[PDB]
Write an enzyme that holds these catalytic residues in place. Sequence first.
Site, short mmCIF file in Angstrom:
data_model
loop_
_atom_site.label_atom_id
_atom_site.label_comp_id
_atom_site.label_asym_id
_atom_site.label_seq_id
_atom_site.Cartn_x
_atom_site.Cartn_y
_atom_site.Cartn_z
N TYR A 1 0.85 -1.18 0.00
CA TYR A 1 0.00 0.00 0.00
C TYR A 1 0.89 1.24 0.00
O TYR A 1 2.11 1.12 -0.10
CB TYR A 1 -0.90 0.01 1.24
CG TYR A 1 -2.02 1.01 1.18
CD1 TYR A 1 -2.95 0.98 0.14
CD2 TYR A 1 -2.17 2.00 2.16
CE1 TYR A 1 -4.00 1.90 0.08
CE2 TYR A 1 -3.22 2.92 2.11
CZ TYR A 1 -4.13 2.86 1.06
OH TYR A 1 -5.17 3.76 0.99
N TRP B 1 -10.81 12.17 -2.54
CA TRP B 1 -9.39 12.15 -2.18
C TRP B 1 -8.48 12.43 -3.36
O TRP B 1 -7.39 12.98 -3.19
CB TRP B 1 -9.01 10.79 -1.58
CG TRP B 1 -9.87 10.35 -0.44
CD1 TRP B 1 -10.88 9.43 -0.47
CD2 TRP B 1 -9.81 10.83 0.91
NE1 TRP B 1 -11.45 9.30 0.77
CE2 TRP B 1 -10.81 10.15 1.64
CE3 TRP B 1 -9.01 11.77 1.58
CZ2 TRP B 1 -11.04 10.38 3.00
CZ3 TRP B 1 -9.23 12.00 2.93
CH2 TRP B 1 -10.24 11.30 3.63
N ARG C 1 -6.73 2.85 3.47
CA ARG C 1 -7.53 1.63 3.36
C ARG C 1 -6.84 0.35 3.81
O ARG C 1 -7.47 -0.70 3.90
CB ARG C 1 -8.00 1.47 1.91
CG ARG C 1 -9.00 2.52 1.46
CD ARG C 1 -9.36 2.33 0.00
NE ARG C 1 -10.45 3.22 -0.40
CZ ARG C 1 -11.72 3.05 -0.07
NH1 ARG C 1 -12.09 2.00 0.67
NH2 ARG C 1 -12.64 3.92 -0.48
O1 LIG Z 1 -6.81 8.35 -6.66
C1 LIG Z 1 -6.02 7.84 -5.89
N1 LIG Z 1 -4.94 7.19 -6.36
N2 LIG Z 1 -4.01 6.60 -5.51
C2 LIG Z 1 -4.15 6.63 -4.17
O2 LIG Z 1 -3.31 6.10 -3.45
C3 LIG Z 1 -5.31 7.32 -3.57
C4 LIG Z 1 -5.49 7.38 -2.20
C5 LIG Z 1 -6.61 8.04 -1.68
N3 LIG Z 1 -6.79 8.10 -0.32
N4 LIG Z 1 -7.54 7.34 0.39
C6 LIG Z 1 -7.49 7.68 1.68
C7 LIG Z 1 -8.22 7.01 2.77
C8 LIG Z 1 -9.26 6.21 2.48
C9 LIG Z 1 -10.00 5.54 3.57
C10 LIG Z 1 -11.08 4.71 3.28
C11 LIG Z 1 -11.77 4.09 4.30
C12 LIG Z 1 -11.38 4.29 5.61
C13 LIG Z 1 -10.31 5.11 5.91
C14 LIG Z 1 -9.61 5.73 4.89
N5 LIG Z 1 -6.67 8.71 1.83
N6 LIG Z 1 -6.18 9.02 0.55
C15 LIG Z 1 -5.29 10.03 0.22
N7 LIG Z 1 -4.80 10.98 0.98
C16 LIG Z 1 -3.94 11.91 0.52
C17 LIG Z 1 -3.34 12.98 1.23
C18 LIG Z 1 -2.48 13.84 0.61
C19 LIG Z 1 -2.15 13.70 -0.73
C20 LIG Z 1 -2.72 12.67 -1.46
C21 LIG Z 1 -3.59 11.80 -0.84
S1 LIG Z 1 -4.51 10.37 -1.36
C22 LIG Z 1 -7.54 8.63 -2.54
C23 LIG Z 1 -7.36 8.57 -3.90
C24 LIG Z 1 -6.25 7.92 -4.43
N1 LIG Z 2 -12.66 -0.22 -2.48
C1 LIG Z 2 -11.23 -0.46 -2.68
C2 LIG Z 2 -10.54 0.86 -3.09
C3 LIG Z 2 -9.31 0.61 -4.01
C4 LIG Z 2 -8.67 1.97 -4.37
O1 LIG Z 2 -9.31 2.83 -5.02
N2 LIG Z 2 -7.40 2.13 -3.93
C5 LIG Z 2 -6.66 3.38 -4.20
C6 LIG Z 2 -5.80 3.76 -2.97
S1 LIG Z 2 -6.81 4.41 -1.59
C7 LIG Z 2 -5.72 3.18 -5.41
O2 LIG Z 2 -5.18 2.09 -5.66
N3 LIG Z 2 -5.51 4.29 -6.18
C8 LIG Z 2 -4.63 4.31 -7.37
C9 LIG Z 2 -5.44 4.19 -8.65
O3 LIG Z 2 -6.69 4.09 -8.57
O4 LIG Z 2 -4.79 4.20 -9.71
C10 LIG Z 2 -10.53 -1.06 -1.43
O5 LIG Z 2 -10.98 -0.78 -0.31
O6 LIG Z 2 -9.49 -1.84 -1.64
#
Ligand SMILES: O=c1[nH][nH]c(=O)c2cc(-[n+]3nc(/C=C/c4ccccc4)nn3-c3nc4ccccc4s3)ccc12
Ligand SMILES: N[C@@H](CCC(=O)N[C@@H](CS)C(=O)NCC(=O)O)C(=O)O
Lengths: 198, 198
Positions: free
Chosen positions: B7, B103, B13
Amino acid sequence: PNYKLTYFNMRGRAEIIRYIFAYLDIQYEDHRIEQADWPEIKSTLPFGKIPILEVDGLTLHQSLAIARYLTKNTDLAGNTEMEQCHVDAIVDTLDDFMSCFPWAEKKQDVKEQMFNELLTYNAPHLMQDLDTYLGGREWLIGMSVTWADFYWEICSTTLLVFKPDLLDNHPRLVTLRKKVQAIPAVANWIKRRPQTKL
Amino acid sequence: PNYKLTYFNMRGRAEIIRYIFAYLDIQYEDHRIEQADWPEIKSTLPFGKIPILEVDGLTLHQSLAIARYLTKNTDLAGNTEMEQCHVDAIVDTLDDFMSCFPWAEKKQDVKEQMFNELLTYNAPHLMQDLDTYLGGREWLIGMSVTWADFYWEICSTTLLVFKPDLLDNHPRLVTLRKKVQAIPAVANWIKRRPQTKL
Ligand SMILES: O=c1[nH][nH]c(=O)c2cc(-[n+]3nc(/C=C/c4ccccc4)nn3-c3nc4ccccc4s3)ccc12
Ligand SMILES: N[C@@H](CCC(=O)N[C@@H](CS)C(=O)NCC(=O)O)C(=O)O
Ligand SMILES: O=c1[nH][nH]c(=O)c2cc(-[n+]3nc(/C=C/c4ccccc4)nn3-c3nc4ccccc4s3)ccc12
Ligand SMILES: N[C@@H](CCC(=O)N[C@@H](CS)C(=O)NCC(=O)O)C(=O)O
Ligand SMILES: [Mg+2]
């Protein structure tokens, strides 16, 4: 057990539950509410959302949580602990994409625009991932049907309404849909269920 | 089995999986990648998303599917099938909300706009429902901790970062948060885990 499923008169998020009851040959009250009857019902719910399933006086919520509960100890759940995980994983992957659509958007022009964009720029990638994942196998997980296959068929049926050519590049995913639709108990439900757009 | 969790270097997550491993006292590789690593990695993923969990070389995806997989047959699952359903339902209600946040939105403000609406209006209602759901009970489901409580503490931790007063009117939900944090294995994890914003 006495079951009562409450949802709107549409397939929507409750359909997976209805497929499971059909496949398992389990009787239940398919309670479909009119929009006007939603307000008074909503106020009595845990988190104000449906579908909900009442089982011997106790209320269950969250469509996938309910679906999983109904498949426990049955052939639809998955044949190994790891395959059960794969079933859950495919289901959430499909649900994640479905949740991207602005189903509640009041402005029709913006809604339609976003639907078309998601279907044209985003869906192709998921369809390919699913096709690759399925490969030459008969079902998405294991060597027998699971509720993940049911979910694929349900989700794709709705997406096809808005994007007819959705699966034109993936005949293997079309074959899977037909296999699910051919299961006698499923075919019967599909044939007798209320015909609704969504 | 050899466990390798992949991760970003953030709780996000994957934290729920990390909590489970800690509670169950299971050693695993906590592989954290940076953005510059993602591209090449994504190309090697089932549905291009993380977290993923490798079990003796086999890849599992979807955080909740993985979390459920690891807690089956443990004391964190729920004591009956019905209770297991409630655990799943509570987790999906929380995930549904957390997933509503943009996010990934690139614009600092258009993003902060959706955030404000979610924190100012939606959040308070969910907190109320959760608080009502918990009642005067010790844990969310049953009479012993389950991964649903874990998820509540994890989700609320992130929400508190953006809205510090989120729980001012719900001391019972705060008490639950502390109960989880007081669990030895969890407290040890919260103590040694990398400090990140989210
Ligand atoms: O679009 C995305 N691409 N890649 C990513 O890693 C990503 C991460 C993302 N984020 N998810 C969360 C937390 C989710 C969550 C779900 C259920 C329970 C608790 C938490 N955080 N987050 C990000 N945070 C930051 C902060 C600063 C800069 C960039 C990011 S991504 C959302 C989208 C993506
Ligand atoms: N519902 C999925 C969410 C999967 C997801 O969207 N993961 C994000 C990180 S929070 C990710 O891989 N982002 C990069 C991308 O979508 O290219 C889970 O809980 O595993
Ligand atoms: O925000 C909403 N408000 N009111 C709604 O009625 C409503 C409906 C809605 N819908 N969701 C779905 C199906 C979702 C799904 C997710 C995963 C797998 C399979 C299905 N359908 N749907 C609606 N359909 C229609 C059709 C005609 C008129 C109105 C509606 S809503 C989403 C959000 C809302
Ligand atoms: N993830 C949930 C979604 C629950 C949900 O948002 N249901 C919608 C209908 S599909 C609803 O209750 N809408 C009425 C409202 O929110 O007032 C599930 O699968 O049950
Ligand atoms: Mg979900």
